[PDB]
Design a binder for this molecule. Structure first.
Ligand SMILES: Nc1nc2c(ncn2[C@@H]2O[C@H](COP(=O)(O)OP(=O)(O)OP(=O)(O)O)[C@@H](O)[C@H]2O)c(=O)[nH]1
Ligand SMILES: Nc1nc2c(ncn2[C@@H]2O[C@H](COP(=O)(O)OP(=O)(O)O)[C@@H](O)[C@H]2O)c(=O)[nH]1
Ligand SMILES: Nc1nc2c(ncn2[C@@H]2O[C@H](COP(=O)(O)OP(=O)(O)O)[C@@H](O)[C@H]2O)c(=O)[nH]1
Ligand SMILES: [Mg+2]
Lengths: 430, 48, 442, 42, 154, 34, 430
């Protein structure tokens, strides 16, 4: 049951390099590609992410796309870069210019056929294909435009598989790009129709994680991409190791999404704690459960206290009792019952996996479906309406070729998404 | 080596705490008084 | 043959510790539950059956439950020397005490624990074939002893019905006192105990302190001495079930003989050869001296003077080397005395018992070793003064509603105070009417 | 036992005597004043 | 003092306690009397006979005194040491000798660690003395299903 | 207006048997005859 | 049966450091946190005040709050400071300015959420929670304002538990702060509604304790805080050690408080006697009771001879007989019968605990509920009335925002408390 990864744009390529480092390390694959692991448990699911090249070697099932090779040359120059298949690097000769219409329509249609040809060549070699996994930012140019283009093409060609995305989204306080609202709105419009599951992360929340919880004096992007690679590699852990209660991407989707538009989720990873404090508190399943629901440990700027949980999922890695899990999930549901949607009798799914990440005795990743995500969409829609009424930067996109009705359609779809969240938040049985 | 580092760290911390606690008694307060006087007289002599 | 012991609260568990120490040493069960194996086989024995049951490998386990709301005392029992004697299920402990509130024991906290206790008692009663009563040890001055004792006796009385229930009860002493709220708890306890007990034996710590100062030579007594004396008394009354004798006495004859009217069930207790070891070797201790002793107020274990009332019935238990003719000569001499008075409606005032087993000596004990002893239980109208003084202290507090807000906050109507106090007032009026000599035609 | 405890306490006082005198010499009190001072410490 | 020859008279793992008590908090007169008394019992006859006196009451008094003292202060004595001390108490000890023996060993034995009141000499495990219990007065429930049982034997 | 309360630690055993930390806190219900 | 402690302001944090030294000594915990005790009796109740860390270490269940970090840095620099959990230290960046209204209204609402999150996190971890214990001064700024704010929040959130406070009150002869009457009056007004039991100590009485009884030539605040830490650790001793007649904070409250407003108590501790004199007099129950009732040994300036005892409690530590305790309390009640309220037949409760503090054969702590406390309230009300008619320093508080009606309400409520004490003092059966 094998996943194919696609990494697009600068953010996607950088996070991807750390992801494939973490996964290759966990399975004991040398940066030359030679297997050097120390248990059969590592080998028996290696097929899930790696294809086998001749005499020993393994190659990682990933497609690299970018519009200027600068990033590709940086990842190729990195410590694990050699593992990647040369034919899998696809690049153009001029940048996206941070413009969705340029990235989607002009250089996009020029390059896109070679990406579909490589993805099909890789897909048709699999004996049974599981979903695709894509990492990109939504605020950028080539990330948004070509990511959503590729998603639409893969959903046309493989409508029965799963489509999963990890996506970086604009902070509420400071923009990294001036035209972020347009690119974000158009990309989320494309995703909510096309995607099966989309993950959202705020860089501001990861910064607050580092400063408050880890008390790091001088954090760097390597740390941010390590936190992301940790959660990303955790979601797939039940796919590729034995456990007392197995789980699957499809099993996550069936238990998490009540209605098909409500598929945007918040993420957290629990045993984050500074090296100085660790001497004062031992690790245990109650401690992880208590820390796991603290909003200090959540990777989005919206706080759970402004919404209600429709559903949640916890995936545990490590040797632990089911009894402790059951009483923790009961106690949290009973004591805070007003913050849980009452027409669902039990909102949390649990899963247990035997193999923890190296150097931690146990770990859990938390997935939450909460209505407070509506505040983010209202804020982005407000900023979009402020910009659009005044035609603030529209001539660039119109000069690339976009019809103005697309912007009004995307705005209407965001307003309907906000309305649907608001109606389901205050619904009652009556 | 981690065990050795941990043991020596405990030894230094415990010795520091012990020598900090021993000045909370009442003889040591009078002896602080007398050393301050010795100090006060000596600095005064230099001032002249 | 069998009897089941229920120990409630702090005084009842500590008295249980002293009782089971004594009963073990009298039968010979080693604290690990076995018996010595180096002796000759002879013939087998059964006297333990009243208090112990065997599994079949020959380990012994005792017919008791320990009930408390705070952990500390039962956890002390769990970690002590007798750890292996008790079944661990028998040692039942709650989370937090009843804080001298009858309301806390009865309504809020004891209500959670009581059904486990009833299930354990049921499990005991199912493993019997000639159960002939319950023995209960508690104090009515504290919150959990009053509230859970009442609730448990009510439930036992519905489930088991006609079976007899005999209580050993520590009442609040008339001027030594330990807590302020003692009158409220004792009145409210006595209201429940009136309906649901067949005989209640009353003890006061001030009397056992006086007895240990005057008769024994102990300058600084502590609760272990008093609890061991109580254990000796219980052993004397239950000895009639366990050993050969001239005149045996089953627990139902006490209940039929001592209680004339269904409310009149509170009895006085006394013990004769309370004597120190140095005096004991200078003196003989014949029957007539100890029979004369049990009627002197210096011998009593409850602080009341029987000269201010009239006896209704007396039960005298003799154990050891005694001959019936000598007990008869002694009782007839007592009957002749003019400062000893019986109600004129009770001509046959005495019940006698004669048992061959002498009282046991405990290695750390303070009583001397003696060849014979006598124990007395008697019903007398003087007891009415104890209730009247408790009720007076209640009236003093209740005139200003001195503490009522605790009880009302923990769930009880204020009206319940007045009902119980009026019921005890009716008990004084009952004791006035039953105690009036003869009658008149006009 | 009480006598044993107070003897050990006096020994500890002598130890801190020596340590404090050495520390005072380390600070740099002048020699004549230090000698008179340690004479009146006994 | 003589450490080598005194292992079996005392219990196995009490040498450090004896050394600590003797070196640290033993008084000068106390240690003089301690080594004197240790010498005077250490030389006793392992199989000395009972004392002979013209009064049986005095003989009983001496025997019960020795038994009580040995059963009392033999917390860390060995069986040979207990026997030798018993023989010395009945035979050679005087009044002041017994007083000094008690004075030494009451401080030698004790530890002064607080312990709960019930465990403090209220509920200790009693020794082996269950023999001699009068077993002729307990009831016996005869069995009608087995005429050859030990129960039916008179 | 009620603040969020994170979950609690599992309750320890007060003694062998008993309903201190089980799923069902209430032991049982006594049934009066009838 | 575990207590959670909060130490607030300079006085509270300083007393707390000595308290946790005394408690760590009593349970044989090394300042590194390693258990080094010498009897199982020490270990078997360590949970009452300590939480367990994994290998050696134990951590003390306390929250530290202050408005300027100077004190907090002093306790961290102290000999036991490392034991405290780092995440448990909460501090702001500017002082109370000795002003109740600023400390209560402006910085109070700013910090208060962070103290409650830690206090709730610590409380909800307990398997069964006993009352809270708080140390603070009433004359100060952060002590009065933040103590009463926190007390009100904990009483809202945990109204069925016990709320216990220890409080320092202004001496009759010399003030340490000019605005003491306002802060004391407003804080006592808050306490009489919110608190369940409050203890008051005068520093002048501690000076008289030291000089007459202990004869110290040069006392320091370490000695006063040691006397206080000794009694504080003594009141809870029966909660945490075995004994012949167990007692509990709730058991104390039920026997001590006749009516719910009458919950302010006097303090004393009996076996104070100099090391030189101790050789001349052995401990015994007559000596302890006689010293225990001598007003020389009582820790407040008000004297019992001007009032009457409603109730009293004595907690004895050590191996002793119950007969002497009971008969001494009877003889003392009978011989001095005019000083005991006559409509209660026995005013004294006794309790006995087996384990004394190390190096004392026996000790007793005395709790007394006496009407002579009314003179203190009357004196404070007098000084308030002198200050309030002319708005002597009132503009600071009004500039923070308080309405003067709050001051008139607090004065009226305290005056009614004085009237209620006076009516019950002179009441009769008739
Ligand atoms: N004879 C005797 N009396 C005791 C003993 N312990 C307590 N008492 C008396 O019983 C009364 C106190 O009752 P307690 O047993 O302490 O009350 P409780 O059952 O513990 O109820 P709670 O306090 O709610 O736990 C007082 O009159 C004490 O003198 C004891 O060990 N022996
Ligand atoms: N977490 C993370 N965010 C990144 C990284 N690189 C860029 N970003 C963010 O992604 C956004 C910029 O998008 P970008 O990748 O430059 O879009 P592109 O020009 O189309 O490739 C900004 O919000 C950046 O903060 C990275 O390595 N890690
Ligand atoms: N017992 C004791 N009292 C103190 C200590 N420090 C200050 N005080 C008293 O507390 C009052 C001053 O309150 P303070 O702590 O400064 O209030 P804050 O400014 O809010 O912290 C005065 O009555 C001081 O005498 C101390 O270390 N021990
Ligand atoms: Mg109790």
């Amino acid at each position: 049951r094998e996943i194919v990864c696609v990494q697009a744009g600068q953010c996607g390529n950088q996070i991807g390099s750390k992801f494939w480092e973490v996964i290759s390390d966990e399975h004991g694959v040398d940066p030359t590609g030679t297997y050097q692991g120390d248990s059969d448990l590592q080998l028996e699911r290696i097929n899930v992410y790696f294809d086998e090249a001749t005499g020993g070697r393994y190659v990682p099932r990933s497609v690299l796309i970018d519009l200027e090779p600068g990033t590709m040359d940086s990842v190729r120059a990195g410590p694990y870069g050699q593992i990647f298949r040369p034919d899998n690097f696809i690049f153009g000769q001029s940048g996206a210019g941070n413009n969705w219409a340029k990235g989607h329509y002009t250089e996009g249609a020029e390059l896109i056929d070679s990406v579909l040809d490589v993805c099909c060549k890789e897909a048709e070699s699999c004996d049974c294909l599981q979903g695709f996994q894509i990492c990109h930012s939504l605020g950028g140019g080539t990330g948004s435009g070509m990511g959503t283009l590729l998603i639409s093409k893969l959903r046309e060609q493989y409508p029965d598989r799963i489509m999963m995305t990890f996506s970086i989204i604009p902070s509420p306080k400071v923009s990294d790009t001036v035209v972020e609202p347009y690119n974000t709105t158009l990309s989320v419009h494309q995703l909510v129709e096309n995607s099966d599951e989309s993950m959202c992360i705020d860089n501001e929340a990861l910064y607050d994680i580092c400063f408050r919880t880890l008390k790091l004096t001088t954090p760097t992007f390597g740390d941010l991409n390590h936190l992301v690679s940790a959660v990303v590699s955790g979601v797939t852990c039940c796919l590729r190791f034995p456990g007392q209660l197995n789980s699957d991407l499809r099993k996550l989707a069936v238990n998490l999404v009540p209605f098909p538009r409500l598929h945007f989720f918040m993420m957290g990873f629990a045993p984050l704690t500074s090296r100085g404090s660790q001497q004062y508190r031992g690790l245990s399943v109650p401690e992880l459960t208590q820390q796991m629901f603290d909003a200090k440990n959540m990777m989005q700027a919206a706080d759970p206290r402004h919404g209600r949980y429709l559903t949640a999922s916890a995936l545990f890695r490590g040797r632990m009792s089911t009894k402790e899990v059951d009483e923790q999930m009961l106690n949290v549901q009973n004591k805070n019952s007003s913050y849980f949607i009452e027409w669902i009798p039990n909102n949390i799914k649990s899963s247990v996996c035997d193999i923890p990440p190296k150097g931690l005795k146990m770990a859990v990743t938390f997935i939450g479906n909460n209505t407070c995500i509506q505040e983010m969409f209202r804020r982005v829609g407000e900023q979009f309406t402020l910009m659009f009424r005044r035609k603030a930067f529209l001539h660039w996109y119109t000069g690339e070729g976009m019809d103005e009705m697309e912007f009004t359609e995307a705005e209407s779809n965001m307003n309907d998404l906000v309305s649907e969240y608001q109606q389901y938040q205050d619904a009652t049985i009556e | 080596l981690e065990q050795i580092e941990e043991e020596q760290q405990r030894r230094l911390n415990l010795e520091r705490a012990k020598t900090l606690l021993d000045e909370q008694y009442d003889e040591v307060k009078a002896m602080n008084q007398i050393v301050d006087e010795a100090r006060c007289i000596a600095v005064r002599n230099a001032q002249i | 043959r069998e009897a089941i012991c229920i120990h409630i609260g702090q005084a009842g568990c500590q008295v249980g510790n002293a009782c089971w120490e004594l009963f073990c040493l009298e039968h010979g069960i080693q604290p690990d539950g076995a018996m010595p194996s180096d002796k000759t086989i002879g013939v087998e024995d059964d006297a333990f059956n009243t208090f112990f049951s065997e599994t079949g490998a020959g380990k012994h386990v005792p017919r008791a439950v320990f009930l408390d709301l705070e952990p500390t005392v039962v956890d002390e029992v769990r970690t002590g020397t007798y750890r292996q004697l008790f079944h661990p299920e028998q040692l039942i402990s709650g989370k937090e005490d009843a804080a001298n509130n009858y309301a806390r024991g009865h309504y809020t906290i004891g209500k959670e624990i009581v059904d486990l206790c009833l299930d354990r008692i049921r499990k005991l009663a199912d493993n019997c074939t000639g159960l002939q009563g319950f023995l209960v040890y508690h104090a009515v001055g504290g919150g959990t002893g009053s509230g859970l004792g009442a609730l448990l006796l009510e439930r036992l009385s519905v489930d088991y019905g006609k079976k007899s229930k005999l209580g050993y009860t520590v009442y609040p002493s008339p001027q030594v006192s330990t807590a302020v709220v003692e009158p409220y708890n004792s009145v409210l306890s006595t209201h429940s105990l009136l309906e649901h007990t067949d005989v209640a034996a009353m003890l006061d710590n001030e009397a056992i302190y006086d007895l240990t100062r005057r008769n024994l030579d102990i300058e600084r007594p502590t609760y272990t001495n008093l609890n061991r004396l109580i254990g000796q008394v219980v052993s004397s009354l239950t000895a009639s079930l366990r050993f050969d004798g001239a005149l045996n006495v089953d627990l139902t004859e006490f209940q039929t003989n001592l209680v004339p009217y269904p409310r009149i069930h509170f009895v006085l207790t006394s013990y004769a050869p309370v004597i120190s070891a140095e005096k004991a070797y200078h003196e003989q201790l014949s029957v007539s001296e100890i029979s004369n002793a049990v009627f002197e107020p210096a011998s009593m274990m409850t602080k009341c003077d029987p000269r201010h009332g009239k006896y209704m019935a007396c039960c005298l238990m003799y154990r050891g080397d005694v001959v019936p003719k000598d007990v008869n000569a002694a009782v007839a001499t007592i009957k002749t005395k003019r400062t000893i008075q019986f109600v004129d409606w009770s001509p046959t005032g005495f019940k006698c018992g004669i048992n061959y087993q002498p009282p046991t000596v405990v290695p750390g004990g303070d009583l001397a070793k003696v060849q014979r002893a006598v124990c007395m239980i008697a019903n007398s109208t003087a007891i009415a003064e104890v209730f009247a003084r408790i009720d007076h202290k209640f009236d003093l507090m209740y005139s200003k509603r001195a503490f009522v807000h605790w009880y009302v906050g923990e769930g009880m109507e204020e009206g319940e105070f007045s009902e119980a106090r009026e019921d005890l007032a009716a008990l004084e009026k009952d004791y006035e009417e039953v105690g009036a000599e003869s009658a008149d035609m006009d | 036992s009480i006598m044993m405890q107070i003897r050990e306490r006096e020994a500890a006082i002598e130890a801190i005597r020596q340590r404090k005198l050495k520390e005072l010499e380390e600070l740099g009190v002048p020699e004549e004043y230090c000698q008179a001072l340690q004479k009146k410490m006994k | 003092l003589m450490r080598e020859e005194y292992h079996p008279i005392f219990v196995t793992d009490s040498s450090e306690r004896i050394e600590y008590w003797y070196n640290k908090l033993a008084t000068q007169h106390q240690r003089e009397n301690f080594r004197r008394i240790c010498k005077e019992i250490s030389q006793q006859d392992p199989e000395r006979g009972l004392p002979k006196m013209s009064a049986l009451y005095s003989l009983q008094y001496c025997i019960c005194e020795a038994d009580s003292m040995i059963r009392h202060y033999g917390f860390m004595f060995s069986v040979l040491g207990k026997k030798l001390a018993r023989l010395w108490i009945m035979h050679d000890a005087s009044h002041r000798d017994k007083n000094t023996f008690t004075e030494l060993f009451t401080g030698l034995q004790t530890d002064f660690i607080p312990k709960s009141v019930m465990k403090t000499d209220f509920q200790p495990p009693e020794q082996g003395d269950y023999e001699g219990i009068d077993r002729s007065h307990f009831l016996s429930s005869i069995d009608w299903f087995n005429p050859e049982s030990k129960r039916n034997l008179p | 207006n009620k603040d969020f309360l994170p979950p609690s630690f599992p309750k320890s055993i007060n003694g062998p048997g008993g309903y201190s930390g089980c799923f069902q806190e209430r032991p049982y219900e006594f049934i009066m005859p009838g």
